[PDB]
Design a binder for this molecule. Structure first.
Ligand SMILES: CC(=O)SCCNC(=O)CCNC(=O)[C@H](O)C(C)(C)COP(=O)(O)OP(=O)(O)OC[C@H]1O[C@@H](n2cnc3c(N)ncnc32)[C@H](O)[C@@H]1OP(=O)(O)O
Length: 170
């Protein structure tokens, strides 16, 4: 199982594995953008909407994989505004339910942070469901908690919940 940065040219190889990861993460209960009715048709559409920012270089995408089998993934959105070059937003960090607790989340974030540094990004920020396993995760990775935004998004079943803002100065 290896970590690879995905390009526009290698995307096709991981597209299916990435849609299944999103699929299992959503139905595992996480708030990562979708509802309980997400099916593979919609996961594929999510994957296809990533292709252009990945080809344009503003969205970096990684996966931890066994060939085409994707066990986890992480993305970094490089801010492109003329006064925001010092920052980037971590998003879509996900690990198959069955492969959790084995350190994959952390192997991804360590890559993300090192590439962030190689792209002169002094600031990494993100938001994630308040009270979720993702909170203890970022905290363990020494990300600082800013606080919450109430009713930020709904859980896959409809319930409104807050998101919690975290950051890391690299
Ligand atoms: C911007 C963002 O991406 S927000 C999206 C966040 N993603 C999600 O909520 C998706 C659902 N969750 C997941 O896919 C996973 O649980 C992730 C990505 C949050 C990370 O999970 P894993 O890959 O299994 O984490 P990993 O084992 O690398 O975490 C390392 C440390 O984090 C902490 N940790 C991980 N899982 C947990 C948990 N369930 N409870 C408490 N602490 C935990 C621990 O400190 C752990 O060190 P340890 O194993 O010695 O105790």
């Amino acid at each position: 199982a290896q970590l690879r940065r995905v390009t526009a040219e290698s995307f096709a190889h991981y597209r299916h594995g990435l849609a299944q990861l999103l699929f299992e993460t959503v139905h595992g209960g996480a708030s990562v953008g979708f509802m309980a009715d997400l099916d593979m048709q919609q996961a594929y559409a999510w994957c296809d909407g990533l292709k252009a920012d990945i080809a344009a270089g503003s969205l970096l995408l990684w996966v931890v994989a066994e060939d085409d089998n994707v066990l986890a993934s992480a993305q970094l959105s490089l801010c492109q505004k003329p006064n925001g070059l010092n920052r980037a937003e971590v998003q879509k960090l996900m690990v198959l339910p069955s492969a959790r607790g084995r350190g994959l989340g952390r192997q991804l974030m360590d890559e993300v942070e090192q590439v962030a540094v190689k792209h002169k990004r002094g600031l990494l920020h993100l938001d994630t469901e308040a009270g979720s396993v993702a909170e203890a995760f970022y905290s363990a990775l020494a990300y600082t908690r800013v606080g919450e935004l109430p009713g930020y998004c709904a859980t896959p079943d409809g319930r409104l919940h807050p998101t919690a803002i975290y950051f890391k100065t690299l």
